[PDB]
Every structure is written in structure tokens, then in C-alpha cells.
Short mmCIF file of C-alpha atoms and ligand atoms in Angstrom, two decimals:
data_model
loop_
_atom_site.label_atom_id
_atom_site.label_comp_id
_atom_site.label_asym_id
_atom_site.label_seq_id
_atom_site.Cartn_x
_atom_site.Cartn_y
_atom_site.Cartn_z
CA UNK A 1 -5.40 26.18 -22.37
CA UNK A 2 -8.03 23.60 -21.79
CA UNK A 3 -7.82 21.47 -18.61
CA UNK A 4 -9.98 18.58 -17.13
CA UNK A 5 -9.66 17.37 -14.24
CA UNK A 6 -10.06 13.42 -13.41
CA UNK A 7 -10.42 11.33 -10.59
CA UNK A 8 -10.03 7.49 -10.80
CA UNK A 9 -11.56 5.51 -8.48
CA UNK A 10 -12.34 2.02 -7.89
CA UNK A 11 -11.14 -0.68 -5.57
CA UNK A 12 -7.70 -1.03 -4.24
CA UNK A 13 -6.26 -3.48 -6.42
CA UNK A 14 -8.10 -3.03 -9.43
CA UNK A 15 -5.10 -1.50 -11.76
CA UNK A 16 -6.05 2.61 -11.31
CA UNK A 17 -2.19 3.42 -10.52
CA UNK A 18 -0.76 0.97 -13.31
CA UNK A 19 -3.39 2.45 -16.18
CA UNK A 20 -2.45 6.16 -15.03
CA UNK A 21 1.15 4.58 -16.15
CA UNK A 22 0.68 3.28 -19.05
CA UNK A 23 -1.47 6.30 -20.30
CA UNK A 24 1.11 8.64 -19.10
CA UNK A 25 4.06 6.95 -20.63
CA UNK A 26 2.17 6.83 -24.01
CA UNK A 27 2.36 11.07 -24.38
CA UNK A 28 4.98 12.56 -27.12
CA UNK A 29 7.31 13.96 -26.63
CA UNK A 30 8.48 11.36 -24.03
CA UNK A 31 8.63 12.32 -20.25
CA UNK A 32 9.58 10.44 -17.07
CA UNK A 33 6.05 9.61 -15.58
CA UNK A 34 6.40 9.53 -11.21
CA UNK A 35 4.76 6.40 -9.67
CA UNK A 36 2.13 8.98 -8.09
CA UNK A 37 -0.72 10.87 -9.49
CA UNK A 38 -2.31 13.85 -7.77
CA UNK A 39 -3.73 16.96 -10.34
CA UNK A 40 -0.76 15.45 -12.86
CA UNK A 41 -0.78 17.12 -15.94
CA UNK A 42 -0.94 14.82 -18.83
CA UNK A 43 -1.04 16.15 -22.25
CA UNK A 44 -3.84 14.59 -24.70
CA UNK A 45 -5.22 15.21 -28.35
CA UNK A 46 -8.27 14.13 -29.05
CA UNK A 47 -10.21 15.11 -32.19
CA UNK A 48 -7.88 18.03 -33.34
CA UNK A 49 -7.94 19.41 -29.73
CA UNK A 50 -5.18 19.89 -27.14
CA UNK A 51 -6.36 19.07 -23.48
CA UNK A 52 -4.52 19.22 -20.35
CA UNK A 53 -5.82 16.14 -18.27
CA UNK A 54 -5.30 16.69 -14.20
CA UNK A 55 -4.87 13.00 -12.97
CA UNK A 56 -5.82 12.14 -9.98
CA UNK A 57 -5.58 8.78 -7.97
CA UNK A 58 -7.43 7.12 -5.17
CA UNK A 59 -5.21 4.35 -4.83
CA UNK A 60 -3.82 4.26 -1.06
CA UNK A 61 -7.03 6.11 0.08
CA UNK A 62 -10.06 3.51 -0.84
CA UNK A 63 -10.57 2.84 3.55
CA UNK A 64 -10.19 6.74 3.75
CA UNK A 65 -14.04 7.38 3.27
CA UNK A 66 -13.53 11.19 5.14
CA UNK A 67 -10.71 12.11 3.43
CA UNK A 68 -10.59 10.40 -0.01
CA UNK A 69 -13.79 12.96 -0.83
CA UNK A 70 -11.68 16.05 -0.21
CA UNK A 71 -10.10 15.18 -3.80
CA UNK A 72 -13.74 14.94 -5.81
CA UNK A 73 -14.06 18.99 -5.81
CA UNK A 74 -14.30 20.49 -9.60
CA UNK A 75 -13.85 17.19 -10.96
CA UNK A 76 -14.73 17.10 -14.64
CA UNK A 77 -14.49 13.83 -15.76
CA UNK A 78 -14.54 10.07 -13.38
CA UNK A 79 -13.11 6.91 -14.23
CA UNK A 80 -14.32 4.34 -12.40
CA UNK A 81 -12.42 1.20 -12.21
CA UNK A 82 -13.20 -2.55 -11.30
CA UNK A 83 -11.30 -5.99 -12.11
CA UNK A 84 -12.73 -8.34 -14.37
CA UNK A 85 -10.36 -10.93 -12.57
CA UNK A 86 -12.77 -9.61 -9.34
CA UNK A 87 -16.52 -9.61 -8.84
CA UNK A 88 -16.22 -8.31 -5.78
CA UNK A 89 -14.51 -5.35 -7.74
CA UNK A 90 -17.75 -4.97 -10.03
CA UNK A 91 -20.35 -5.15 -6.77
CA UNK A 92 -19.33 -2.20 -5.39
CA UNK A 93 -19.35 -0.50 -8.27
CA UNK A 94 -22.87 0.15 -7.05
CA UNK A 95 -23.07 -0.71 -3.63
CA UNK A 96 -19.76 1.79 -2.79
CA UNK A 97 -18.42 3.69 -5.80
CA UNK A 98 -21.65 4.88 -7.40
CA UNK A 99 -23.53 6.70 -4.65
CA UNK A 100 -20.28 8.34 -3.74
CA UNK A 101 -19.43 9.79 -6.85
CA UNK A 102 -22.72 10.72 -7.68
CA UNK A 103 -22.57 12.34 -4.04
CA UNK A 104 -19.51 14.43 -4.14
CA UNK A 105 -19.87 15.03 -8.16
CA UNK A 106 -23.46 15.45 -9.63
CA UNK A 107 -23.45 15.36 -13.47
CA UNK A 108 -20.08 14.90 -13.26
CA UNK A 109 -19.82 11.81 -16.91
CA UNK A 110 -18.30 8.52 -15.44
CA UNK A 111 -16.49 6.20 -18.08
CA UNK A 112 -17.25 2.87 -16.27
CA UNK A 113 -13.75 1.08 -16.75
CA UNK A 114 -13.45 -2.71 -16.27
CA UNK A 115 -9.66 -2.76 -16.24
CA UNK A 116 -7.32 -6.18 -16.65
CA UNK A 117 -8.95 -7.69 -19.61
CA UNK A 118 -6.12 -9.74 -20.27
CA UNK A 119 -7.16 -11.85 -17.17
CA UNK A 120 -10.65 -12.90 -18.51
CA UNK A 121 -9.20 -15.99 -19.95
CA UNK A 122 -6.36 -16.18 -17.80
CA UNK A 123 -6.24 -20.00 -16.58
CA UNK A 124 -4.81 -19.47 -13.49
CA UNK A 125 -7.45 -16.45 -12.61
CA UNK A 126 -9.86 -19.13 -13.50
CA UNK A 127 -9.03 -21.65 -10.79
CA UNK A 128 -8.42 -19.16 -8.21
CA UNK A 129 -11.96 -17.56 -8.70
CA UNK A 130 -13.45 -21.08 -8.95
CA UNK A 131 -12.20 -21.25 -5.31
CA UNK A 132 -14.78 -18.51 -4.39
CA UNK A 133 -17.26 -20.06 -6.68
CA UNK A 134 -16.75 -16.89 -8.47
CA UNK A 135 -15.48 -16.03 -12.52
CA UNK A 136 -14.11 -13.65 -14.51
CA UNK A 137 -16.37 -10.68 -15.34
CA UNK A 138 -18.21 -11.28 -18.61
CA UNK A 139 -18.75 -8.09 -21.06
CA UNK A 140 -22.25 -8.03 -20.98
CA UNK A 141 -22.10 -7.58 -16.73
CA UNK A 142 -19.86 -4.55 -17.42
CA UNK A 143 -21.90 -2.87 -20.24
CA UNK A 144 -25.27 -3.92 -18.36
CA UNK A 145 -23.65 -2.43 -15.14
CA UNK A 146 -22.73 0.62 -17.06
CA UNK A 147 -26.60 1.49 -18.24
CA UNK A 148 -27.55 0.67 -14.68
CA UNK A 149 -25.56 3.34 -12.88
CA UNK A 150 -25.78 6.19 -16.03
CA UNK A 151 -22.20 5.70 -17.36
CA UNK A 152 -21.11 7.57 -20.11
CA UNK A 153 -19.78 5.02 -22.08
CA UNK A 154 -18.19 1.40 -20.69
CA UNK A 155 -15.03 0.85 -21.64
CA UNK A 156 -12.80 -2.61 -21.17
CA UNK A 157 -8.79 -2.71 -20.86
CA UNK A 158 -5.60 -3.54 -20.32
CA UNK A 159 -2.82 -2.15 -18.52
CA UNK A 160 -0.35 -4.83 -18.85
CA UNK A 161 -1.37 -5.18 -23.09
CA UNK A 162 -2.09 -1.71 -23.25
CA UNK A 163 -5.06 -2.88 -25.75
CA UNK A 164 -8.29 -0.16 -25.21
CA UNK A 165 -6.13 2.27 -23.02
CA UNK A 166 -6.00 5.32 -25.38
CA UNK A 167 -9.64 4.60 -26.17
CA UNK A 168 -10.48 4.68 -22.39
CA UNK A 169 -8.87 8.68 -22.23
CA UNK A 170 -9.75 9.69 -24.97
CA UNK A 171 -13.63 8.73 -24.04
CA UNK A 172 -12.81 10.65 -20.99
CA UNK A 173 -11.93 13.48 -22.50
CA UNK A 174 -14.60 13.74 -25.00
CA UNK A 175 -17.20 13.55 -22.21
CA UNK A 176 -15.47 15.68 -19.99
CA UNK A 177 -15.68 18.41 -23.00
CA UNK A 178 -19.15 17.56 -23.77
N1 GDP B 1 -2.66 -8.89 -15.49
C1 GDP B 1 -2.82 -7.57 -15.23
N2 GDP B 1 -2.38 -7.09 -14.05
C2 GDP B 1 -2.50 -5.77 -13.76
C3 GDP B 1 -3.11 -4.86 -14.73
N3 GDP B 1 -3.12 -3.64 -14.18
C4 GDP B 1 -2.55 -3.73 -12.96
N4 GDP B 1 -2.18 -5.02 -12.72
C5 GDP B 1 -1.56 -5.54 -11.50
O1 GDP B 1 -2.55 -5.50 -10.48
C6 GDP B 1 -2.00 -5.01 -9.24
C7 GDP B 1 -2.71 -3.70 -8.81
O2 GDP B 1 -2.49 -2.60 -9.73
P1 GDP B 1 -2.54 -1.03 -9.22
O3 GDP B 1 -2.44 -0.28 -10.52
O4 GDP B 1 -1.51 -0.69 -8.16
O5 GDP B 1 -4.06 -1.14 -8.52
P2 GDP B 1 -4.62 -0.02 -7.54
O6 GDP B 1 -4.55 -0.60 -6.16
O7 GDP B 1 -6.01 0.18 -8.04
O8 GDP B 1 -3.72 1.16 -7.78
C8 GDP B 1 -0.49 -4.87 -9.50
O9 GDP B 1 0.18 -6.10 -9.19
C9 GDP B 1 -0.46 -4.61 -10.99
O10 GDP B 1 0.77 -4.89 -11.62
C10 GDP B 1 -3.55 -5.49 -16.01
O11 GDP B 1 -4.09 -4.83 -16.92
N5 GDP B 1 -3.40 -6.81 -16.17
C1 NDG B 2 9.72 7.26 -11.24
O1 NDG B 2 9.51 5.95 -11.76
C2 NDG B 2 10.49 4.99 -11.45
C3 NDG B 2 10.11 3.71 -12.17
O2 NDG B 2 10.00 4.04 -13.54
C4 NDG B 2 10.53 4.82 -9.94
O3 NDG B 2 11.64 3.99 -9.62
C5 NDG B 2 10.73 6.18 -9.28
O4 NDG B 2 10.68 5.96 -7.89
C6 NDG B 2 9.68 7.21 -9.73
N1 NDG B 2 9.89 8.53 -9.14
C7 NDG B 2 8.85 9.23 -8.66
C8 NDG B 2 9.16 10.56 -8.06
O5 NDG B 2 7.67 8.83 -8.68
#
């Protein structure tokens, strides 16, 4: 039985927990998915191929910096998550996320994930950004951010639509196969 093991990680707030949710509840035959996600076993298929995907989540341990890193070992595959509602989310996809992971998990593929699409033309995002002199995350930061830090592929979704999440794991699990 195949099994890959994947860490999301990203900052707190960014929407790791709910698209762990929405991915789980999406498997046939239906199960009841928990609220938490530590080495859970989702099943996937993904090009005629039956892969058990070990989930686990960083969310609750993003200020842990000594023990969050106890959860990267045999990692096969990273998701790593920022806002598009948050450019603060997206710096520290290189100034936090990036050196870590390629720290604690060299050659390890990361699917760079820019996660609540639905918010990119969300008016009242908008205004509250504008507030920071700040915007939504355009695609072209996220796919130029992507090349920049050696993602496998970038990959934009949402949790609440559910538009681009089966695209996001099955990306994950190609690369975490290949
Ligand atoms: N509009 C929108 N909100 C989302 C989405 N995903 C998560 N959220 C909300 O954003 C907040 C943080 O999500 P969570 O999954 O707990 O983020 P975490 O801290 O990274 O685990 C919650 O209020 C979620 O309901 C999304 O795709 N779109
Ligand atoms: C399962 O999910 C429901 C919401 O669907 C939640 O109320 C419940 O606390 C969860 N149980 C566990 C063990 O995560």
C-alpha cells in the first residue's frame, strides 16, 4: 500500500485546517472527517493509482519554532500555504516558511498553495487591506513566488468554493510519487 506523508504549513490563519476539511470530506465512500489532522490517513486516486495520504497540520503550532519541526521527519510531500486576502501571508513564504522547510526537508517537492481565492475580489477584503495600504495577492506574485523558492507547481484555491482543491492533492501526490 502506497503512503505519503504531508505536512501543511503556512501562517496561522491562512485556511491549512479548513482545506484539510474540505479535501477530506471529498473521499468516497463517505467518512466523518475529525477537526484535527496529525499522520490522518486520507484515501486518494490519482492517475489509476491508490495512495494513502498521511495529513499533517501545523495549525496551533506556527510560534512553536522548537517543536513544530519534530513533525517534518520522512515527509514526502509539503504544502505550503499563504492568504491571498494577506501579504503578510505571502512574505514569509520566504522570509519564514522556505528556509525552514528546505531545512528540516531537503528535496522534499513543495506545492506552493495560495489558499482563499474567493477573497481576491472580495469588496470588503478590499477596504480592509486598503487600511494597511496593502491588496489582495495577484496571480502572477504567487506563480513568480513559486519559481523563486523552487516550488513544484503553484497552485490557487478555495476552501470555502472548493474550486482548485482536488487539483491542489492531487499535484501533491503526483510529486510526492515522482
Ligand atoms: N473566505 C474564505 N475563508 C476561509 C477559507 N479557508 C479558511 N477560511 C477561514 O479562514 C479562517 C482560518 O482558517 P483555518 O483553516 O483554521 O486557518 P489555519 O489557522 O491556517 O488553520 C477561518 O475563519 C476559516 O473559516 C477560504 O477558502 N475562503
Ligand atoms: C468532528 O467534526 C464535527 C464537525 O463536523 C465536530 O463537531 C467534532 O468535534 C469533530 N470530532 C473530532 C474528534 O474531531
Amino acid at each position: 500500500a502506497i503512503r505519503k506523508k504531508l505536512v501543511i504549513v503556512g501562517d496561522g490563519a491562512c485556511g491549512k485546517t479548513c482545506l484539510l476539511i474540505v479535501f477530506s470530506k471529498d473521499q468516497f465512500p463517505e467518512v466523518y472527517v475529525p477537526t484535527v489532522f496529525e499522520n490522518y490517513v486520507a484515501d486518494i486516486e490519482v492517475d489509476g493509482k491508490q495512495v494513502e495520504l498521511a495529513l499533517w497540520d501545523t495549525a496551533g503550532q506556527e510560534d512553536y519554532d522548537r517543536l513544530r519541526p519534530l513533525s517534518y521527519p520522512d515527509t514526502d510531500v509539503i504544502l505550503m500555504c499563504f492568504s491571498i486576502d494577506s501579504p503578510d501571508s505571502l512574505e514569509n513564504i520566504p522570509e519564514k516558511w522556505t528556509p525552514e522547510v528546505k531545512h528540516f526537508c531537503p528535496n522534499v517537492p513543495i506545492i506552493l498553495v495560495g489558499n482563499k481565492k474567493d477573497l481576491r475580489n472580495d469588496e470588503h477584503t478590499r477596504r480592509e487591506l486598503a487600511k494597511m495600504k496593502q491588496e489582495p495577492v495577484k496571480p502572477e506574485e504567487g506563480r513568480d513566488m513559486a519559481n523563486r523558492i523552487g516550488a513544484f507547481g503553484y497552485m490557487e484555491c478555495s476552501a470555502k468554493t472548493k474550486d482548485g482543491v482536488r487539483e491542489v492533492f492531487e499535484m501533491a501526490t503526483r510529486a510526492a510519487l515522482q
